[PDB]
């Protein structure tokens, strides 16, 4: 589903989360931007990489990765004190992306 990104999943170059009028786009210029009828958000990462992709890690941080480099272009938040686990980014009805976790209850797989 296009409104959700779970830990270990990736948003590829020029792909996006969307809900209604809002989109969170991993751009070809390597900038990650939230477009909404409101206050947007940017990684401000224009031109910092090639064929960039976005992943949500096991600490609730977004990582932008570049084809041309081993270490991430950007990680946000840069530092966290979270439990290692499964996290979810949701682009809500609020037109924002909120990261939630770790997982605390679930039905049995699967």
């Amino acid at each position: 589903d296009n409104n959700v990104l779970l830990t270990g999943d990736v948003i590829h170059t020029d792909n996006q989360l969307s809900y209604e009028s809002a989109a969170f786009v991993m751009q070809g210029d390597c900038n990650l931007v939230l477009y909404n009828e409101a206050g947007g958000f940017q990684s401000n990462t224009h031109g910092r990489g090639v064929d960039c992709t976005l992943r949500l890690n096991n600490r609730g941080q977004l990582e932008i990765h570049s084809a041309n480099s081993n270490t991430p272009v950007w990680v946000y938040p840069r530092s966290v004190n979270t439990v290692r686990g499964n996290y979810a980014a949701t682009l809500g009805p609020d037109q924002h992306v909120t990261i939630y976790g770790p997982a605390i209850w679930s039905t049995p797989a699967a």
Partner: protein, 112 residues
């Protein structure tokens, strides 16, 4: 009141009278019989249930601000609750593409 979303339930949100979350061929339904059921197909096909059928005529399910999922009757008595609770905050219940319903929280960070 938070607007209803097809595949996700947010803290403070409520479901009742056969309302559901859905993705693909999966449904998470708060049935009119007080039973919360995750079904696929349904080859009339239940994956998980609260097992609370017959405990109420006007039950609702609610996700709380401690990640708790409660099924509650008209009298406000709880007929099922998930074991967990976390830090006070905002949580989400997601019906996943893998057929699991999962609660995640609290909010680590947001673009807002």
């Amino acid at each position: 009141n938070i607007p209803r979303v097809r595949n996700v339930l947010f803290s403070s949100q409520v479901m009742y009278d056969n309302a559901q979350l859905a993705t693909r061929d999966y449904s998470l339904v708060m049935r009119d019989d007080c039973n919360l059921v995750l079904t696929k197909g349904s080859k009339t096909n239940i994956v998980w249930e609260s097992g609370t059928s017959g405990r109420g005529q006007h039950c609702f399910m609610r996700l709380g601000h401690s990640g708790e999922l409660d099924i509650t009757d008209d009298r406000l008595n709880t007929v099922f609750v998930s074991n967990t609770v976390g830090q006070e905050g905002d949580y989400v219940l997601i019906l996943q593409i893998n057929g699991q319903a999962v609660v995640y929280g609290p909010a680590v960070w947001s673009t807002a």
